[PDB]
Design an enzyme around this catalytic site. Structure first.
Site, PDB file in Angstrom:
ATOM      1  N   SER A   1     -29.037  75.503  33.155  1.00  0.00           N
ATOM      2  CA  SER A   1     -29.109  76.951  33.332  1.00  0.00           C
ATOM      3  C   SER A   1     -27.743  77.618  33.467  1.00  0.00           C
ATOM      4  O   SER A   1     -27.667  78.844  33.332  1.00  0.00           O
ATOM      5  CB  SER A   1     -29.969  77.289  34.544  1.00  0.00           C
ATOM      6  OG  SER A   1     -31.341  77.159  34.233  1.00  0.00           O
TER       7      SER A   1
ATOM      8  N   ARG B   1     -26.667  72.585  46.664  1.00  0.00           N
ATOM      9  CA  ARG B   1     -25.666  73.057  45.713  1.00  0.00           C
ATOM     10  C   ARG B   1     -24.794  74.140  46.336  1.00  0.00           C
ATOM     11  O   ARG B   1     -23.561  74.076  46.276  1.00  0.00           O
ATOM     12  CB  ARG B   1     -26.348  73.579  44.447  1.00  0.00           C
ATOM     13  CG  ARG B   1     -27.130  72.523  43.670  1.00  0.00           C
ATOM     14  CD  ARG B   1     -27.951  73.150  42.548  1.00  0.00           C
ATOM     15  NE  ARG B   1     -28.945  74.096  43.056  1.00  0.00           N
ATOM     16  CZ  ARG B   1     -29.766  74.809  42.289  1.00  0.00           C
ATOM     17  NH1 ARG B   1     -29.719  74.689  40.969  1.00  0.00           N
ATOM     18  NH2 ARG B   1     -30.635  75.646  42.842  1.00  0.00           N
TER      19      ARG B   1
ATOM     20  N   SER C   1     -33.556  82.842  36.679  1.00  0.00           N
ATOM     21  CA  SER C   1     -33.278  81.778  35.710  1.00  0.00           C
ATOM     22  C   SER C   1     -34.464  81.554  34.764  1.00  0.00           C
ATOM     23  O   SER C   1     -34.991  80.448  34.637  1.00  0.00           O
ATOM     24  CB  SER C   1     -32.889  80.484  36.435  1.00  0.00           C
ATOM     25  OG  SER C   1     -31.980  79.734  35.659  1.00  0.00           O
TER      26      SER C   1
ATOM     27  N   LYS D   1     -26.686  79.934  30.733  1.00  0.00           N
ATOM     28  CA  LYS D   1     -27.076  81.333  30.672  1.00  0.00           C
ATOM     29  C   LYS D   1     -25.869  82.261  30.643  1.00  0.00           C
ATOM     30  O   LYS D   1     -25.982  83.387  30.142  1.00  0.00           O
ATOM     31  CB  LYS D   1     -27.990  81.667  31.851  1.00  0.00           C
ATOM     32  CG  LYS D   1     -29.388  81.056  31.735  1.00  0.00           C
ATOM     33  CD  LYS D   1     -30.398  81.797  32.600  1.00  0.00           C
ATOM     34  CE  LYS D   1     -31.807  81.255  32.399  1.00  0.00           C
ATOM     35  NZ  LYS D   1     -31.966  79.891  32.977  1.00  0.00           N
TER      36      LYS D   1
HETATM   37  C1  1S7 Z   1     -31.781  75.932  34.666  1.00  0.00           C
HETATM   38  O1  1S7 Z   1     -31.022  75.104  35.121  1.00  0.00           O
HETATM   39  C2  1S7 Z   1     -33.274  75.798  34.825  1.00  0.00           C
HETATM   40  N1  1S7 Z   1     -33.624  74.420  35.150  1.00  0.00           N
HETATM   41  C3  1S7 Z   1     -34.761  73.790  34.834  1.00  0.00           C
HETATM   42  O2  1S7 Z   1     -35.787  74.354  34.459  1.00  0.00           O
HETATM   43  C4  1S7 Z   1     -34.730  72.291  34.917  1.00  0.00           C
HETATM   44  C5  1S7 Z   1     -35.017  71.757  33.540  1.00  0.00           C
HETATM   45  C6  1S7 Z   1     -36.153  71.767  32.733  1.00  0.00           C
HETATM   46  C7  1S7 Z   1     -35.941  71.157  31.493  1.00  0.00           C
HETATM   47  C8  1S7 Z   1     -34.645  70.680  31.304  1.00  0.00           C
HETATM   48  S1  1S7 Z   1     -33.696  71.005  32.714  1.00  0.00           S
HETATM   49  O3  1S7 Z   1     -33.858  76.167  33.586  1.00  0.00           O
HETATM   50  C9  1S7 Z   1     -33.320  75.582  32.403  1.00  0.00           C
HETATM   51  C10 1S7 Z   1     -33.676  76.741  35.951  1.00  0.00           C
HETATM   52  N2  1S7 Z   1     -32.791  76.347  37.026  1.00  0.00           N
HETATM   53  C11 1S7 Z   1     -32.933  76.598  38.268  1.00  0.00           C
HETATM   54  C12 1S7 Z   1     -31.647  76.577  39.066  1.00  0.00           C
HETATM   55  O4  1S7 Z   1     -31.585  75.929  40.132  1.00  0.00           O
HETATM   56  O5  1S7 Z   1     -30.673  77.209  38.604  1.00  0.00           O
HETATM   57  C13 1S7 Z   1     -34.249  76.862  38.841  1.00  0.00           C
HETATM   58  C14 1S7 Z   1     -34.511  76.563  40.100  1.00  0.00           C
HETATM   59  C15 1S7 Z   1     -35.317  77.476  37.975  1.00  0.00           C
HETATM   60  S2  1S7 Z   1     -35.430  76.558  36.412  1.00  0.00           S
END
Ligand code: 1S7
Ligand code: CL
EC number: 3.5.2.6
Length: 245
Positions: A50, A230, A98, A53
Site C-alpha cells: 500500500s 509499525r 487504503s 499508493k
Molecule cells: C496495503 O498495504 C493494503 N494491504 C493489504 O491489503 C494486504 C495485502 C493483500 C494482498 C496483497 S498485500 O492493501 C494493498 C492495505 N494496507 C493496510 C495498511 O496497513 O496500510 C490496511 C490495513 C488495509 S489493506
C-alpha cells in the site's frame, strides 16, 4: 555528497521489546545525515504494497485519472472484507483507509506503458511492473527498500519528481496523518501478505518548525495483530532521538 548511513543498533531494543524484528531508517534533512539500526535490512528490497499508493496517486493525478482530491470514486457494489472500503471515496479517504479497488482502477486506467515510463522517471525501486497491471505492487515484481523509499520521499517533499507541482502537493495533502503544535507527520502505511516475507511498512516524514526528518520502516508481520507496531516502534525511535516529545 553522501556521508553514509550511520548505524545505531540502540533502536533494536524497541523491536525486541515488542518481540518483533525489522528496520527503521531516519534522514535528517538539514544536516544531510542518515541513521538506521540495521544497514543491511535498510537496503533489503520488498514489495511496496500500500505504500505504492503514493506513486500511484501521483501518476493518476498528473495524467488526469484523478481530477482533484474531491472527485468521488463510487463503490462498485462488491462487498469486501474491510468495512470502510464498501463506501464511496475520494483521494483523501481512499488513501486514509487504503482502498485497494480504487487504486486498482487507477492502475488499469494509467496503463502498463505509462506506469513503467513514470516509475522510471521516479527512479522508484527496481522499476519492474511485471505482473498484473492492477496488482504488481501486491504480487508482482516491483521491489523497493527503505533507503530507496526515503530517496523517493525526499524528491516528493521538494517537488522534484517529474510530475506537476500540483500533483505533488495534492498527494502530500492526502498523506497527512497527524498534526499538533509539535510536529506534522505525512506518511503511508503498508502491509504485504501474498509473497513471503510478510512485512509491515511505514514511510513518510516528520515536519518540525525548522527541519524535516524522513523515515522509512518495515518489520516482519507474521500476523495482523501487530500492525499497530509499525507506528508504535517508529515513534519510540523518534522520541528517543528527541525528534518528537
Ligand atoms: C496495503 O498495504 C493494503 N494491504 C493489504 O491489503 C494486504 C495485502 C493483500 C494482498 C496483497 S498485500 O492493501 C494493498 C492495505 N494496507 C493496510 C495498511 O496497513 O496500510 C490496511 C490495513 C488495509 S489493506
Ligand atoms: Cl496539509
Amino acid at each position: 555528497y553522501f556521508q553514509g548511513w550511520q548505524e545505531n543498533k540502540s533502536w533494536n531494543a524497541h523491536f525486541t521489546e515488542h518481540k518483533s524484528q525489522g528496520v527503521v531508517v531516519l534522514w535528517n534533512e538539514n544536516k544531510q545525515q542518515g541513521f538506521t539500526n540495521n544497514l543491511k535490512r535498510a537496503n533489503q528490497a520488498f514489495l511496496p504494497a500500500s505504500t505504492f499508493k503514493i506513486p500511484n496517486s501521483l501518476i493518476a493525478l498528473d495524467l488526469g485519472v484523478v481530477k482533484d482530491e474531491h472527485q468521488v470514486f463510487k463503490w462498485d457494489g462488491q462487498t469486501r472484507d474491510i468495512a470502510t472500503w464498501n463506501r464511496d471515496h475520494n483521494l483523501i479517504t481512499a488513501m486514509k483507509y487504503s482502498v485497494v479497488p480504487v487504486y486498482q482502477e487507477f492502475a488499469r486506467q494509467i496503463g502498463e506503458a505509462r506506469m513503467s515510463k513514470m516509475l522510471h522517471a521516479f527512479d522508484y525501486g527496481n522499476e519492474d511492473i511485471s505482473g498484473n497491471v492492477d496488482s504488481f505492487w501486491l504480487d508482482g515484481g516491483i521491489r523497493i527498500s527503505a533507503t530507496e523509499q526515503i530517496s523517493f520521499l525526499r524528491k516528493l517533499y521538494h517537488n522534484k519528481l517529474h510530475v506537476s507541482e500540483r500533483s505533488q502537493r495534492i498527494v502530500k495533502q492526502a498523506m497527512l496523518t497527524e498534526a499538533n503544535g509539535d510536529y506534522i507527520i505525512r506518511a503511508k502505511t503498508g502491509y504485504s501478505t501474498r509473497i513471503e516475507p510478510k512485512i509491515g511498512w511505514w514511510v513518510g516524514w516528520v515536519e518540525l518548525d525548522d527541519n524535516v526528518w524522513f523515515f522509512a520502516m518495515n518489520m516482519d508481520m507474521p500476523t495482523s495483530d501487530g500492525l499497530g507496531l509499525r507506528q508504535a516502534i517508529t515513534k519510540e525511535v523518534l522520541k528517543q532521538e528527541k525528534i518528537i516529545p
